[PDB]
Amino acid sequence: WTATSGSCKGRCFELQEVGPPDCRCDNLCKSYSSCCHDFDELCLKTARGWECTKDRCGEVRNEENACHCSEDCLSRGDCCTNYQVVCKGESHWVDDDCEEIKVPECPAGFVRPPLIIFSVDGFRASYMKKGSKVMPNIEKLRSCGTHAPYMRPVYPTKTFPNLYTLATGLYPESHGIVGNSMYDPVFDASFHLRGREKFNHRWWGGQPLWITATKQGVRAGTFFWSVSIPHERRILTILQWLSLPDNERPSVYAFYSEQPDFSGHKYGPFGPEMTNPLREIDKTVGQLMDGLKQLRLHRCVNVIFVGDHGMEDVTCDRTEFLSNYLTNVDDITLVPGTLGRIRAKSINNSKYDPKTIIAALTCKKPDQHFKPYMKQHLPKRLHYANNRRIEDIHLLVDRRWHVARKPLDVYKKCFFQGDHGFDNKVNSMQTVFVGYGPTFKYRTKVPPFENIELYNVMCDLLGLKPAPNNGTHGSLNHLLRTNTFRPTMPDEVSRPNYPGIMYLQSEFDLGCTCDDKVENKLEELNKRLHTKGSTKERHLLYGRPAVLYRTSYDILYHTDFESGYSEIFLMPLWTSYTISKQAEVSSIPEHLTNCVRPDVRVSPGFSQNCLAYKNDKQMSYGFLFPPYLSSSPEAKYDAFLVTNMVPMYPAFKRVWAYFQRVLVKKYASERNGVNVISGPIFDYNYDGLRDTEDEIKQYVEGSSIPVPTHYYSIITSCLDFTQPADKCDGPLSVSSFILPHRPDNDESCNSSEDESKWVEELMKMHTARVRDIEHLTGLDFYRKTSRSYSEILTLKTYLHTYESE
Ligand SMILES: *[C@@H]1O[C@H](CO)[C@@H](O[C@@H]2O[C@H](CO)[C@@H](O[C@@H]3O[C@H](CO[C@H]4O[C@H](CO)[C@@H](O)[C@H](O[C@H]5O[C@H](CO)[C@@H](O)[C@H](O)[C@@H]5O[C@H]5O[C@H](CO)[C@@H](O)[C@H](O)[C@@H]5O)[C@@H]4O)[C@@H](O)[C@H](O[C@H]4O[C@H](CO)[C@@H](O)[C@H](O)[C@@H]4O[C@H]4O[C@H](CO)[C@@H](O)[C@H](O)[C@@H]4O)[C@@H]3O)[C@H](O)[C@H]2NC(C)=O)[C@H](O)[C@H]1NC(C)=O
Ligand SMILES: NS(=O)(=O)CCCC(=O)N1CCN(c2ccc3ncn(CC(=O)NCc4ccc(Cl)c(Cl)c4)c(=O)c3c2)CC1
Ligand SMILES: [Ca+2]
Ligand SMILES: [Ca+2]
Ligand code: NA
Ligand code: NA
Ligand SMILES: [Zn+2]
Numbered sequence: 001w002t003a004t005s006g007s008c009k010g011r012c013f014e015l016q017e018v019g020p021p022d023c024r025c026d027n028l029c030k031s032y033s034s035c036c037h038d039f040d041e042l043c044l045k046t047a048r049g050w051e052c053t054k055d056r057c058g059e060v061r062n063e064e065n066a067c068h069c070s071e072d073c074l075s076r077g078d079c080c081t082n083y084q085v086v087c088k089g090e091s092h093w094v095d096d097d098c099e100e101i102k103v104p105e106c107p108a109g110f111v112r113p114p115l116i117i118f119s120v121d122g123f124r125a126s127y128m129k130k131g132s133k134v135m136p137n138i139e140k141l142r143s144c145g146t147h148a149p150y151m152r153p154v155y156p157t158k159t160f161p162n163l164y165t166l167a168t169g170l171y172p173e174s175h176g177i178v179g180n181s182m183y184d185p186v187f188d189a190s191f192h193l194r195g196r197e198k199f200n201h202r203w204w205g206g207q208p209l210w211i212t213a214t215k216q217g218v219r220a221g222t223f224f225w226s227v228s229i230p231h232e233r234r235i236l237t238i239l240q241w242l243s244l245p246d247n248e249r250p251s252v253y254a255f256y257s258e259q260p261d262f263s264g265h266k267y268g269p270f271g272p273e274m275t276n277p278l279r280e281i282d283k284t285v286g287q288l289m290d291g292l293k294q295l296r297l298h299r300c301v302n303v304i305f306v307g308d309h310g311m312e313d314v315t316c317d318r319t320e321f322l323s324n325y326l327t328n329v330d331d332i333t334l335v336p337g338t339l340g341r342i343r344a345k346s347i348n349n350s351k352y353d354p355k356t357i358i359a360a361l362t363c364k365k366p367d368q369h370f371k372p373y374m375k376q377h378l379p380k381r382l383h384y385a386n387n388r389r390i391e392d393i394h395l396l397v398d399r400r401w402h403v404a405r406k407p408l409d410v411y412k413k414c415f416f417q418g419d420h421g422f423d424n425k426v427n428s429m430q431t432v433f434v435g436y437g438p439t440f441k442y443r444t445k446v447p448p449f450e451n452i453e454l455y456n457v458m459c460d461l462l463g464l465k466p467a468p469n470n471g472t473h474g475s476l477n478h479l480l481r482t483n484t485f486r487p488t489m490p491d492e493v494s495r496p497n498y499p500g501i502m503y504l505q506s507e508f509d510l511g512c513t514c515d516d517k518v519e520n521k522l523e524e525l526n527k528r529l530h531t532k533g534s535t536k537e538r539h540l541l542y543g544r545p546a547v548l549y550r551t552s553y554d555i556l557y558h559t560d561f562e563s564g565y566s567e568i569f570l571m572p573l574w575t576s577y578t579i580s581k582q583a584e585v586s587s588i589p590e591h592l593t594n595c596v597r598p599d600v601r602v603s604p605g606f607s608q609n610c611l612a613y614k615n616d617k618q619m620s621y622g623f624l625f626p627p628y629l630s631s632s633p634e635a636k637y638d639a640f641l642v643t644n645m646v647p648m649y650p651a652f653k654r655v656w657a658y659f660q661r662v663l664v665k666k667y668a669s670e671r672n673g674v675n676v677i678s679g680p681i682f683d684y685n686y687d688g689l690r691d692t693e694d695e696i697k698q699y700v701e702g703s704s705i706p707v708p709t710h711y712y713s714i715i716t717s718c719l720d721f722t723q724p725a726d727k728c729d730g731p732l733s734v735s736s737f738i739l740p741h742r743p744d745n746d747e748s749c750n751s752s753e754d755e756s757k758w759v760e761e762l763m764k765m766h767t768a769r770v771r772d773i774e775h776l777t778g779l780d781f782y783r784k785t786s787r788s789y790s791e792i793l794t795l796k797t798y799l800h801t802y803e804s805e
Contacts, residue, residue: 001020001021002020002021002023002024002033002034003021003022003023004023004034004035004036004037005023005036005037006022006023006036006037007036007037007038007042008023008025008035008036008038008039008042008043009038009042011025011036012025012039012042012043013025013026013027013043013237013240013241014026015219015221015241015250020034023035023036023037024036025039025043026221027221027224027225027226027229027234027237028222028224028225028226029226030226030227030228030229031199031224031226031227032196032199044229044233045064045065045066046066047062047064047065047066048065048066049066050066050067050080050081050232050236050287051080051082051086052067052069052079052080052082052083052085052086052087053069053086054086054087056069056086056087057069057086057087058070058071058087061073066080066232066233066236067079067080067081067083067236068080068083069083069086069087074294076243077239077240077242077243077295078236078239078240078243079294081235081236081239081287081288081290081291081294082287082290083294084290084293084294085290090293092286092290093137093140093286093289093290093292093293093298094136094137094140094286094289098140098143098144098443100442101299101437101438101442102438102481103438104299104300104437104438104439105296105299105300105438106297106300107295107296107297107300109246110246110300111246111251112218112251112462112463113300113301113302113437113438113439113461114242114250114251114252114253114297114300114301114302115251115252115253115301115302115304115458115461115462116238116252116253116254116255116288116301116302116303116304117166117223117252117253117254117255117304117306117458118255118257118285118288118303118304118305118306119163119166119223119254119255119256119257119306119307119308120257120259120260120281120305120306120307120308120432121159121256121257121258121259121260121261121262121307121308122259122260122261122262122264122265122307122308122309122310122311122418122420123260123261123281123307123308123310123431123432124260124264124269124307124310124311124428124430124431124432125149125150125151125307125310125430125431125432126150126310126430127260127278127432128142128147128432130270131274131275131278134275134278134279134282135278135279135281135282135285136282136286137282137283137285137286137289138281138282138285138305138434141285141303141305141434141436142305142434143443144436144442144443145303145434145435145436145437145440145441145442145443145444146434146435146436146440146441146442146444146445146446146479147433147434147435147444147445147446148432148433148445148446148447148448148449149445149447149448150430150431150432150433150448151306151307151430151431151432151433151448151449151450151451152424152425152430152448152449152450152451152799153165153307153308153309153310153424153429153430153431153451154171154172154383154424154450154451154452155172155382155383155384155423155424156172156178156179156338156339156384156421156422156424157309157310157338157420157421157422157423157424157426157429158179158180158309158420158421159180159193159261159308159309160177160179160180160193161177161178161179161180162308162309162431162451163223163256163308164177164204164206164208165451165452166306166308166451166454166455167208167209167210167223167455168206168207168208168209168455168467168469169206169452169453169454169455169456169466169467169469169470169471170205170206170452170455170469170470171383171384171452171470172383172384172387173383173384173385173386173387173390174205174206174386174387174470175204175205175206176203176204176205176206176387176389177191177203177204178384178387178389178390179335179339179341179389180192180193181193181335182203182389183343183389184203184388184389185388186388187202191203206467206469207467208222208223209223209252209455209458209459210222210223210252212459212464212465212466212467213251213252213462213464216464216465218251218252218462218463218464219248219249219250219251219252220250220251220252221250222254223254223256224256225254225255225256227258231255231257231284232284232287234255234256235255235284235287235288235291236291238253238255238288238291239288239291239292239294239295241253242292242295242297243295251462252458252462255284255288257281257284259277259280259281260274260277260278260281260311261308261311261420262277263276263277264277264311264418265311265416265417265418265419266415266416266417266418267417267418268311268313268417268418269310269311269312269313269418269428271417271418285305288303289303299438300437300438301437302435302436302437302438302439302440302461303435303436303437304433304434304435304454304458305432305433305434305435305436306431306432306433306434306451306454307431307432307433308431309420309421309429309431310420310427310428310429310430310431311418311419311420311428312338312399312400312418312419312420312422312426312428312429313400313417313418314338314400314401314402314416314417314418314419315414315416315417316402316410316411316414316415316416317414318369318400318401318402319401319402319403319404319410320368320369320370320397320401320402320403320404321403321404321405321406321407322334322340322342322361322403322404322405322406323405323406323407324365325360325361325364326357326360326361327360328357329405329406330345331344331345331346331349331351331352332344332345332352332357332405333345334403334404334405335391336402336403336404336405336409337397337402337403337404337419337421338397338401338402338419338420338421338422339394339395339396339397339403339421339422340370340393340394340395340397340403341390341391341393341394341395342357342391342392342393342394342395343391343392343393354374354392354393357372357393358372358373358374358393361395362746362749363746363749368749369397369398369400369401369403370395370396370397370398370401370403371395371396371747372393372394372395372396373393373394373395373396373747374392374393374394375390375391375392375393375394375686376686376709377740377742377747378394378396379738379765379766379767380683380688380710380738380766380768380772380776381425381738381766381767381768381769381772381799382423382424383470383688383772385686386685386686386687386688396423397421397422398422399422399423399426399428399429402419425767425799425801425802425803426803427803427804430448431451433449433451433454435457435479438481438482439461439480439481439482439483440479440480440481441478441479441480441481442481444479446476446478446479447794447798449475449476449794449797450797450799452469452470452471453471453472453475453476453797454471454476455469455471456469456471456473456476456485457476457479457480460480460483460484460485461483463483472771472793472796472797473485473487474486474487474789474790474793475790475793475794475796475797476794477790477793478790478791478794484790486789486790487789487790487793488789489546489780489783489789490546490548490780491546491548492546492547492548492780493546493547493548493549493550494547494549494550494551494552494553496544496547496553496554496555496564497552497553497554497555498554498555499554499556499601499602500601501531501600501601502600502601502603503598503600503601503602503603503604504600505598505600507604508598508604508607509604509609510596510598510604510607510608510609510610510611510642511609511610511611511614512596512597512598512609512610512642513594513595513596513610514592514595514596514597514640515591515592515595516592516595516597516637516640527559527634530557530558530559530635531557531558531601532557533557533562534557535557535558535559535560536557536562538578538726539560539561539562539576539577539578539675540562540576541576541578541675541716541725541726542675542716542732542781542782542783542784542785543782543783543784543785544562544564544576544783545564545573545574545677545779545780545781545783546779546780546783547564547573547778547779548778548779548780549690549778551566551568552566552567552568553565553566553567553568553573554567554601554602556572556599556601556602556643558625558635558638558641559631559632559635559638560577560625560629560630560631560635560638560639561575561576561577561624561625561638561639561644562575562576562577563575563576563624563625563643563644565602565643567602567606568693569680569682569693569706570606570607570608570704570705570706571608571643571645571646571647571680571705572624572643572644572646572679572680573679573680573777573779574677574678574679574777574779575624575625575644575677575678575679576675576676576677577625577629577675577676578673578674578675578676578725578726579629579664579665579667579668579673579674579675579676580668580673580724580725580726581668581669581672581673581724583629583631583665583668585628585629585661585665586628586629586630586633586636587628588627588628589633589636592627592636592640595637595640596610596621596640596641596642596645597637597640597641597642598641598642599641599642599643601643602642602643607642607643608642608645608700608703608705609642609703612700612701612702612703612705613647613700615701615702616700616701616702617701618649618701618743619647619648619649619700619701619707620647620648620649620650620653621645621646621647621648622645622646622648622652622653622656622657622660623639623640623644623645623646623660624644624646624678624679625638625639625644625678626639626660626661626664627639627640628660628661629660629664629665646680646708646711647700647705647707647708648711648741649741649742649743651742651743651744651745652711652739652741652742652743654745654751654755654759655739655745655755655759655762655763656711656739657755658755658756658759659713659759659763662755662756663759663760663763664676664715667715667717668725671715671717671718671721671725671733672717672718672721672722672723672724672725673717673718673724673725673726674715674716674717674725675715675716675717675725675726676713676714676715676716677713677714677716677781678711678712678713678714679711679712679777679779680708680710680711680712681708681709681710681711681712681738681773681776681777682695682706682708682709683709683710683776684696684697684698684709688772688775688776689775689776690775690776690777690778693706707741708741709740709741710738710739710740710741710776711738711739711741712736712737712738712739712768712773712776712777713736713737714734714736714770714773714781715734715735715736716732716733716734717732717733717734718730718731718732718733719731719732719733721733729786731787731791731795732782732785732787732795734770734795734798734800735767735800736767736768736769736770736772736773736800737763737766737767737768738766738768738772738773738776739762739763739766740766745758745762747762748761748762764802767799767800767801767802768799769796769797769798769799770782770795770796770797770798771796771797774796781796782795782796
């Protein structure tokens with residue numbers, strides 16, 4: 001109950017919300033149906049529109065008008081945004097030449113440059129170029145400030161998950177807003193875009209920027225807006241707040257536009273109807289910039305122009321129906337559209353079974369336009385599993401398509417021609433980033449980056465300490481003129497042992513055999529040098545990885561590769577080797593096909609054993625450094641050391657063997673040499689973080705050998721490919737992957753075909769950032785390079801997406 005009988009007189013757009021049952025006058029009161037009786041009359045004035053005209057100049061103030069052109073409006077802070085242009089001979093901001101803002105030029109009483117975040121829903125990255133002729137204000141921000149060619153949203157590429165990620169720096173699985181619609185089984189409650197449940201703070205985790213600011217004594221209200229407040233009134237309200245007295249004025253402001261998303265759903269991303277919404281958003285930016293220029297703030301404020309996601313062509317005819325696959329379609333609840341989430345309709349139905357649902361949805365139709373996954377099997381780059389609100393069964397829907405439960409869902413709901421939500425690497429889902437102001441660089445283009453990084457930069461812009469988040473603080477330092485965050489490398493926690501030869505062959509009883517008993521002072525000292533690290537500068541190009549947790553491990557050197565061998569997990573944490581452009585691929589010789597060799601540097605008690613693999617009828621093994629890439633027939637023996645072996649399902653070995661035999665050499669040819677670091681990952685609780693030993697759910701039968709959930713590789717070369725990977729003078733180039741270690745290839749519908757037709761496609765889907773691997777392994781890479789630490793942080797956040805232009 002609201003006592004709407006109170007009044008908004010002197011309170012319009014108050015920043016402190018008042019508590020029930022008292023009526024409200026803040027920018028959210030409409031959403032709650034709680035505005036005072038006179039809020040429209042007092043706070044939503046519209047008389048005479050939003051622009052000054054010649055006849056209004058020097059008018060006698062009339063408090064009914066939406067905005068003012070009287071002589072007193074500048075001191076009242078409530079002129080129409082074009083007042084100085086119409087009445088005082090001034091130019092529009094867009095018509096002024098751009099001039100570098102080398103220092104903030106702020107009025108007295110300003111303690112720091114304010115930050116204004118201007119968020120545009122559904123603003124596809126390519127609009128910046130394709131729409132540039134009709135968006136002169138935005139084009140001036142972009143060209144004069146700092147811009148990326150695109151910014152990558154989080155998955156799912158929906159509004160609320162992305163706007164809340166922008167505000168918190170967190171993945172949706174950690175902030176909790178994991179879709180526009182959600183069921184939380186603990187709350188037993190549902191969240192929707194429409195309605196009031198979403199007002200309850202229990203859904204919204206993390207610490208959004210307005211709260212971070214407020215806790216540290218920087219004034220900031222929430223970034224939400226009631227939809228019925230027109231954009232022109234939102235801009236005027238921002239300009240009015242900026243005219244508050246020093247002690248009352250916020251330092252951070254947010255404008256939100258429901259366009260171009262609204263029209264894009266109706267018309268498609270490039271519908272001819274889309275020009276007008278882009279014009280209208282540009283006009284709104286022009287109002288803000290003109291208004292700042294009136295207030296002498298246009299060379300003081302930092303402005304961020306940022307989108308939440310793009311928009312793809314999607315029509316009702318491109319819908320897959322689960323009723324065409326499942327017999328039991330009435331026993332499931334589907335969250336539908338550009339992604340699918342499936343759970344049981346009734347928790348009382350114990351004949352519901354996810355295994356049979358996944359199987360009924362896997363590769364059933366030749367052109368199938370969605371792929372089912374248990375959430376833990378989704379690509380790790382999506383970071384979309386560790387939340388009870390994310391259903392165990394997920395459908396990744398092809399771009400341009402929808403999934404629905406039954407046909408009647410789609411016509412008892414063609415209306416729409418655009419939609420979004422798909423995989424966040426999809427080109428149509430990319431969105432925009434421009435930063436303009438004293439703290440941003442001048443006329444600077446930066447590489448594409450992810451939106452999870454922006455919270456830290458906004459904290460830097462405001463002098464705030466960010467709450468713990470998923471950005472990598474410092475990775476966007478190259479966007480900023482000043483206020484950079486100079487991170488230090490994390491301290492290594494465990495130092496390695498460097499074992500020498502300490503065991504005789506007969507001390508091992510591993511059940512392994514190798515035909516290696518076939519026998520020189522020149523080449524004995526040489527092999528001894530290799531075991532002491534003489535080739536290490538060739539194969540470990542960027543220093544050894546640092547181990548950032550407590551563990552027991554050994555560094556093992558070899559002619560062709562170096563590894564960090566874990567005495568706890570009985571296998572390497574990492575294996576590093578360089579393959580030059582000139583490297584030759586060879587076979588595993590016949591007599592060495594089943595060869596595994598005890599490593600006389602490592603105790604039998606800390607080694608794997610062949611008998612475990614013989615006995616585990618499900619599990620085979622592979623090697624981290626590939627025998628195919630040995631430098632000589634004699635060095636090849638090192639590749640069959642028990643310390644280079646890792647457990648692999650036979651179905652996974654098809655993938656791994658093709659990567660090692662064919663693709664590494666292909667990359668070395670294309671990139672002019674590559675350095676490869678490969679290793680296992682254990683993430684049985686799917687939290688994106690390294691498992692401790694007591695979290696391992698599966699071992700090689702009858703042994704303490706843990707089975708990885710994934711295998712990674714990080715593939716590094718010189719950005720200037722005229723220089724070989726091992727003699728690189730400048731910046732680096734990287735691609736990485738985190739492949740799921742699965743006992744079938746049900747994910748790859750074409751797996752019955754030769755690996756050349758499906759394996760690289762699998763790998764591309766499971767592309768990763770080095771930072772993703774760092775979280776999953778507790779390792780810190782690139783510790784010894786000639787590059788600045790911020791540049792290396794940017795390199796660790798890079799994702800190779802395999803999308804075209
Ligand atoms: C992305 O960045 C984020 C932010 O840095 C990373 O997430 C952090 O990761 C930590 C590890 O997973 C996690 O630390 C845990 O915090 C527990 C206290 O949690 C509360 O307090 C914090 C701080 O204010 C708060 O942010 C939390 O918010 C979560 O929960 C609420 C709902 O309750 C949500 O609204 C919110 O969205 C968020 O949910 C997310 O995180 C939780 C886990 O906290 C998930 O369950 C959700 O699905 C969702 O993803 C909380 O309100 C603390 O209790 C933990 O301590 C346990 O483990 C330690 C290890 O040191 C052990 O020593 C302790 O004994 C303890 O164990 C006991 O509890 C166990 C569980 O019941 C039990 O089994 C044992 O037997 C013991 O009794 C732990 O320290 C931190 O909370 C999150 N923060 C956030 C915001 O998500 C994220 O990892 C990054 N991602 C990647 C890929 O890098
Ligand atoms: N973690 S915490 O404890 O600090 C709690 C944080 C959440 C919170 O403060 N509330 C309290 C206020 N609630 C609320 C009330 C009225 C509303 N009226 C309109 N709209 C539409 C809109 O603004 N869309 C654009 C939009 C802009 C920014 C973003 Cl980030 C997002 Cl996602 C969407 C709303 O979303 C809306 C929301 C949400 C929960
Ligand atoms: Ca949106
Ligand atoms: Ca884990
Ligand atoms: Na076996
Ligand atoms: Na298959
Ligand atoms: Zn939308």
